[PDB]
Design a protein around this ligand. Structure first.
Ligand SMILES: C[N+](C)(CCOP(=O)(O)O)CC(=O)c1ccc(-c2ccc([C@]3(O)C[N+](C)(C)CCO3)cc2)cc1
Ligand SMILES: C[N+](C)(CCOP(=O)(O)O)CC(=O)c1ccc(-c2ccc([C@]3(O)C[N+](C)(C)CCO3)cc2)cc1
Ligand SMILES: Nc1ncnc2c1ncn2[C@@H]1O[C@H](COP(=O)(O)OP(=O)(O)O)[C@@H](O)[C@H]1O
Ligand SMILES: Nc1ncnc2c1ncn2[C@@H]1O[C@H](COP(=O)(O)OP(=O)(O)O)[C@@H](O)[C@H]1O
Ligand SMILES: [Mg+2]
Ligand SMILES: [Mg+2]
Lengths: 339, 339
């Protein structure tokens, strides 16, 4: 649309500067990749200084985001950029931001299991967990957010859908306490977590450090075990499935013990790189982490199942959110019973 | 106060973590340095990881700051920290932030003229001007802000003070156009400027890179000439004077031509360090910059004079804001006439 093109043009010229000052309106169009758009400097123009030739314009939702929330999100994004753990940040303004376009493609679900890529993901996740960030270090995110989601679900206006509420079908309010008790018995260090290391958020670089993570919507200080366990759960789900419900679950694609240990070995090699450990101490760290993840992986099911019920309340036919929620809760109980 | 101590305690434990988790309330008190407070970890405690032992708690005003303004301020502060151009950032929360306490003292007015310190200030200012920041690069800050201040002054409710309005005494609305025309004829590159490089914002490090700038309240993309000229104006004003109006002006302390060239040589040595320039090209850059600064220094007087009238509207006997404004406008006209 004429207005959207004009805004993108103005934002690029004003926030990027340099060669962008010489671009004429008729030479620039936005390409949707929807709230995300690619903007490219015309080929005939040389760059002036270090200003980027390739950016992504990210527009914020029509949805209300609090002031404090936007401060935290923007500060987080800016810091991860400086530390080379996310895309560079080139503009912040009320409507959105301009980010580095990373030449890349996202991973696919099946690629997560390839040993060399899985080792690289482990290494990157551990790098992320090494970050000191200016946010609360108290680990209230996991159960605080789940408690909030449950309250929000309880408060939803009735819609007319006749089915038993999933909170009741799966006794989720009671079950949350059972999970809390289990995880309270399971030590897991509190670290800066990504919280959504799915294939769609892992970019395979065309100009390799071979990967970059994106999508920090959910990132927070949280239990290490959640970030790893959540990643393992993602081996099961493909969100590119082309028929309703527009995801597919393959439960047998959950990582085997050997696949989990391979990831864990590479994770710990990075996490513990500055430490002098015997092979025996290393073995213990690996075994303990295997158990830790087996339990915190259950929180991935529980968290996303609750989140998905809320998504269903704002959706119709574009994705089977309620179906997905039920899949996560079924796997929760199955895996809980296999402990 | 009990409440303020408790809040500081909670913020330190929650945002700093590490050894701060082991601190007991009775071991921590805040020291005012008022919205700024020092918090120190007890001496008996060893640090756990990289968490700071010495922080400054900065509380935000009771005064309204917009959402977008707080995003920009916080992002700016976080980026300058990463680039080692400001204090590290350890917590952001609705009420304020936790920053690195920099072991240091501020410079004094008379120290600005010492050649070795002035060379270091020039070098640091040029470093700051090298920054690419995710903010508007269009140079509307100077006249946009002055136009806004003038409008705000025009809109002030009458107070009962009988004196001629300084806007009228000095014909400032007309004079702003005269200044704009002068500066429009004076090329000055647009760079990321500090905008308030006064002695009180230059910290002399106890653990030396010998200086750190602080106070980014006014920082923005702006004309280089303003940042340098503003700094030179600051050689004249001491804000520690102990009798009303609580500043002192020493007009003869404005830098001589030689003092200005000394600063300029060191500024350009840093700004142009990656460039192959002849001694002749270097001489021209120095001479041109001398003229540039002579003109943009006038904007320092004009800007702060307007700002000071606004400060007077919220002040009584703590500082002679209106007196200060008049001093800046008198010097503006004197120096304009000496061009
Ligand atoms: C577990 N998970 C990590 C939760 C957080 O998700 P995000 O990382 O925020 O996406 C992923 C997840 O639950 C998820 C991921 C993707 C989708 C999704 C995928 C595709 C669509 C779709 O509208 C489906 N379509 C058939 C209409 C084609 C265009 O894309 C809509 C939703 C829905 C749910
Ligand atoms: C030109 N300048 C760089 C403008 C921006 O100032 P800031 O860097 O934001 O301070 C500095 C400036 O105009 C200025 C600087 C300092 C002061 C100031 C200095 C001292 C006080 C005072 O309340 C005075 N006191 C006698 C009551 C003792 C305690 O401190 C109050 C105000 C007033 C004005
Ligand atoms: N900085 C970037 N560079 C290149 N591609 C990106 C970038 N950020 C996101 N993408 C692409 O856009 C997709 C969605 O972006 P993301 O930040 O994950 O937002 P969301 O998943 O909330 O829509 C990613 O899967 C990736 O393909
Ligand atoms: N990070 C810091 N470390 C040590 N001292 C600081 C720090 N920040 C500010 N100060 C001290 O506090 C004073 C005021 O802080 P500043 O950030 O300039 O705020 P303002 O001038 O708006 O009150 C400085 O002159 C300096 O003496
Ligand atoms: Mg994503
Ligand atoms: Mg200051």
């Amino acid at each position: 649309s004429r207005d959207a093109e004009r805004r993108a043009y103005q934002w690029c010229r004003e926030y990027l500067g340099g060669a962008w000052r010489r671009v004429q309106p008729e030479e620039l169009r936005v390409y949707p990749v929807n709230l995300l758009f690619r903007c490219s400097l015309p080929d005939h123009l040389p760059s002036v200084g270090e200003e980027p030739r390739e950016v992504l314009l990210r527009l914020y939702g029509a949805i209300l985001q609090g002031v404090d929330s936007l401060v935290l999100e923007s500060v987080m994004f800016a810091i991860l950029a400086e530390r080379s753990l996310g895309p560079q940040l080139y503009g912040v303004f009320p409507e959105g931001r301009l980010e580095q376009y990373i030449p890349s493609r996202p991973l696919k679900t099946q690629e997560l299991r390839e040993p060399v890529l899985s080792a690289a993901i482990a290494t990157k996740m551990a790098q992320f967990h090494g970050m000191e960030m200016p946010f609360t270090k108290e680990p209230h995110w996991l159960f605080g957010t789940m408690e909030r989601y449950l309250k929000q679900i309880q408060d939803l206006p009735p819609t007319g859908l006749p089915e038993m509420n999933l909170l009741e079908m799966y006794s989720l309010k009671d079950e949350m306490g059972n999970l809390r008790k289990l995880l309270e018995s399971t030590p897991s260090p509190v670290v800066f977590c990504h919280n959504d290391i799915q294939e769609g958020n892992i970019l395979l670089l065309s100009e390799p450090d071979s990967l970059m993570l994106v999508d920090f919507e959910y990132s927070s200080y949280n239990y290490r075990g959640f970030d790893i366990g959540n990643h393992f759960c993602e081996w099961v789900y493909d969100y590119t499935h082309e028929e309703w419900p527009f995801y597919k679950a393959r439960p047998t694609d959950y990582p085997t013990q050997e696949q989990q240990l391979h990831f864990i070995r590479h994770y710990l090699a990075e996490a513990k790189k500055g430490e002098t450990l015997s092979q025996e101490e290393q073995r213990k760290l690996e075994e303990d982490l295997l158990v830790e993840v087996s339990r915190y992986a259950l929180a991935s099911h529980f968290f996303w199942g609750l989140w998905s019920i809320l998504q269903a309340s704002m959706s119709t036919i574009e994705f089977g959110y309620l179906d997905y929620a039920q899949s996560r809760f079924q796997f929760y109980f199955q895996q809980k019973g296999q402990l």
